[PDB]
Amino acid sequence: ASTRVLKVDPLFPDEKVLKEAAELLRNGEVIIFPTETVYGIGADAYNEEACKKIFKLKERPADNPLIVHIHSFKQLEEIAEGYEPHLDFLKKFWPGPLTVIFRKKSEKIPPVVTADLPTVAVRMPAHPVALKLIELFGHPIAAPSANISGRPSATNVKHVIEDFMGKVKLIIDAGDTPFGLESTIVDLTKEKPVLLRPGPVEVERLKELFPELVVPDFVRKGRHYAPLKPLILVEDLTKMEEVLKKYPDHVVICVEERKELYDDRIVVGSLKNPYSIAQNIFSALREAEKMGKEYIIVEGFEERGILFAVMNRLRKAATEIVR
């Protein structure tokens, strides 16, 4: 395709770059853009043919539905029904790193976007580049994470280029994404709200708002976020010794406060500042897989606050888990 990489300021992006992106979207092209969570790979959400390209480019199963990104509460009314009782909730978290499942109203959103489901995943991203792009473009943007399906979600343009140079016309670069992890997904169609994916809106906070929040087994347990070398997640750190010596040709991903115990290690971040771990975990997976070792070994973390989401991701990535 011959890919343009256009840098923009995250607070006040050059509207001329956004205009170029909007035009491509109008032509039924796919572009890659930043959000506060991860980079997205997006098309016109009302354009069936363009959204099909997203699947082709990611090598993604058709049964995996796309999140529809909006910039206003007015757009919500166009695409979803039955949200009215949750508007107070939404106005508290949007724009922000929250995706919500509602019943689909719109026949404007083709089946391919929603994988033939009667629900639609909606997100209003708290990233001025995304917001302004959507607004200028004039339609919602359907976009999964910017990565080959199965691989770690891009949190910077480097990762995007690894996966997509030559495959898309335009990548908008606004640097490293603030959170580094995908949005919290909460299903609001059932009588009790269901957490479908942990993220920057933390479980603890959702439990405060929704005492009856249901957290399914698949969230707490186990394609997705997986490096090219095998991944060994060590929840029980007492076995760390056993593991290193069982898998000798390795690189470790570890926290700051245990860096000087490993020989060959990438420091993902500090337990002192767990948002640093979230921000960097996917980069760390991509660095690791390069460091020419046979095995990537990752320390486990508390299943609390943002590290809950981190652990969700690592569990879905791991080739073996050590409990």
Ligand X SMILES: Nc1ncnc2c1ncn2[C@@H]1O[C@H](COP(=O)(O)OP(=O)(O)OP(=O)(O)O)[C@@H](O)[C@H]1O
Stretch that binds ligand U6A, among 7-15, 140-148, 210-218, 313-321 (CB under 6 A): 140-148
Amino acid 244 reads L
Site for ligand U6A contains 37 (CB under 6 A): yes
3-state secondary structure of 101: strand
Give me 20's structure tokens. 């170029």
**Dihedral of alpha carbons 122, 124, 125, 130, sign:** positive
Rounded distance, CA 36 to CA 279, Å? 10
Residues 153-192 that bind ligand X (CB under 6 A): 185
Site for ligand U6A contains 144 (CB under 6 A): yes
Rounded distance, CA 132 to CA 280, Å? 26
Site for ligand X contains 58 (CB under 6 A): yes
Residues 191-230 that bind Mg ion (CB under 5 A): none
Rounded distance, CA 94 to CA 110, Å? 24
Tell the smallest beta-carbon distance from residue 79 to ligand X (Å).
12
Helix (H) / strand (E) containing 265? strand 265-269
Q: Hunting for tokens 């994404």 — which residue is that?
A: 177
Rounded distance, CA 55 to CA 64, Å? 9
Site for ligand U6A contains 279 (CB under 6 A): no
Helix (H) / strand (E) containing 239? none
Helix (H) / strand (E) containing 44? strand 40-44
Alpha helices in 94-193 (DSSP H): 111-114, 128-137, 157-164
Can you tell me which of 42, 144, 193, 200 binds ligand X, judged by CB under 6 A?
144
Give the nearest residue (CB) to ligand U6A. 40
Contact letters (x/-) for ligand X, 246-285, by CB under 6 A?
Answer: ----------------------------------------
- Please say whether the beta carbons of 183 and 123 come within 8 A: yes
Helix (H) / strand (E) containing 236? none
* Maximal C-alpha separation, the chain: 58
Alpha helices in 67-143 (DSSP H): 73-79, 87-93, 111-114, 128-137
Can you tell me which of 31, 79, 129, 196 binds ligand X, judged by CB under 6 A?
196
Question: Nearer Cβ to ligand X, position 120 or 171?
Answer: 120
Give me 279's structure tokens. 């921000």
Contact letters (x/-) for Mg ion, 261-300, by CB under 5 A?
Answer: ----------------------------------------
Site for Mg ion contains 184 (CB under 5 A): no
Contact letters (x/-) for Mg ion, 132-171, by CB under 5 A?
Answer: -------------x--------------------------
Site for Mg ion contains 177 (CB under 5 A): no
Can you tell me which of 99, 106, 155, 280 binds ligand U6A, judged by CB under 6 A?
99
Residues that bind ligand X (CB under 6 A): 58, 60, 64-67, 101, 114, 117, 119-121, 144-145, 147, 149-150, 185, 196-197, 224
Residues that bind Mg ion (CB under 5 A): 145
> Binding site residues, as ranges?
37, 60, 64, 69, 119, 123, 143, 145, 153, 183, 197, 225
Residues that bind ligand U6A (CB under 6 A): 35, 37-38, 40, 67, 99, 123, 125, 143-145, 182-183
